[PDB]
């Protein structure tokens, strides 16, 4: 019964850098809109979010390979620990 929460936890762990970067970017843009009253911030937010997200994904292409081996070990022991052995 822990498969779903394991999946969600792993997803949130892996995507944490992009999530936090984009959240902070939109918070900063909100501050700018607070100091710039009559301005449309949604389109600018979308543009900067797209650019920052793709840049972060590119510079983050060095933390993906070993996760496969970690998943090897974890899934092996997990499927081992499912039956009444």
């Amino acid at each position: 019964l822990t498969f779903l929460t394991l999946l969600a936890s792993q997803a949130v762990i892996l995507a944490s850098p992009v999530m936090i970067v984009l959240l902070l970017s939109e918070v900063l843009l909100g501050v700018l809109s607070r100091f710039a009253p009559q301005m449309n911030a949604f389109s600018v937010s979308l543009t900067i979010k797209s650019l920052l997200a793709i840049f972060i994904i590119f510079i983050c292409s060095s933390t993906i390979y070993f996760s496969k081996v970690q998943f090897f070990l974890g899934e092996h022991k997990f499927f081992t620990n499912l039956f009444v052995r």
Partner: protein, 113 residues
């Protein structure tokens, strides 16, 4: 000289813990029961929401504000990269603490630069 109105974020920084605690309290009790009054739960939701809630001369100044924001963003990204790329290895439960620490660190990093 009215730039420094950022104390509001520091004041509302406690909303982090307030929201976490209250929302997960209500979710946990609902999942423990799945049978309730149907209106006591609604009143509890309202109460918790309430407690949680509690010429072109100016263009030069605007561009000054924009360059200040860009400069502080670049400086913060330079000084706080390893923390994020190590939070990639963080356990799920402790992720929120790192999130809050980074948010507070950047909001203190702003300080009108």
């Amino acid at each position: 000289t009215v730039v420094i109105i950022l104390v509001g974020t520091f004041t509302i920084i406690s909303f982090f813990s307030l929201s976490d605690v209250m929302l997960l309290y209500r979710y946990v009790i609902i999942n423990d029961f799945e049978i309730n009054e149907g209106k006591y739960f609604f009143a509890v939701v309202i109460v918790f929401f309430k407690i949680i809630g509690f010429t072109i001369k100016e263009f030069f100044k605007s561009i000054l504000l924009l360059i200040i924001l860009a400069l502080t963003t670049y400086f913060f990204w330079i000084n706080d990269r390893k923390i994020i790329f190590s939070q990639v290895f963080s356990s799920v439960d402790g992720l929120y603490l790192i999130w809050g620490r980074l948010f507070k660190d950047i909001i203190l990093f702003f300080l009108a630069f």
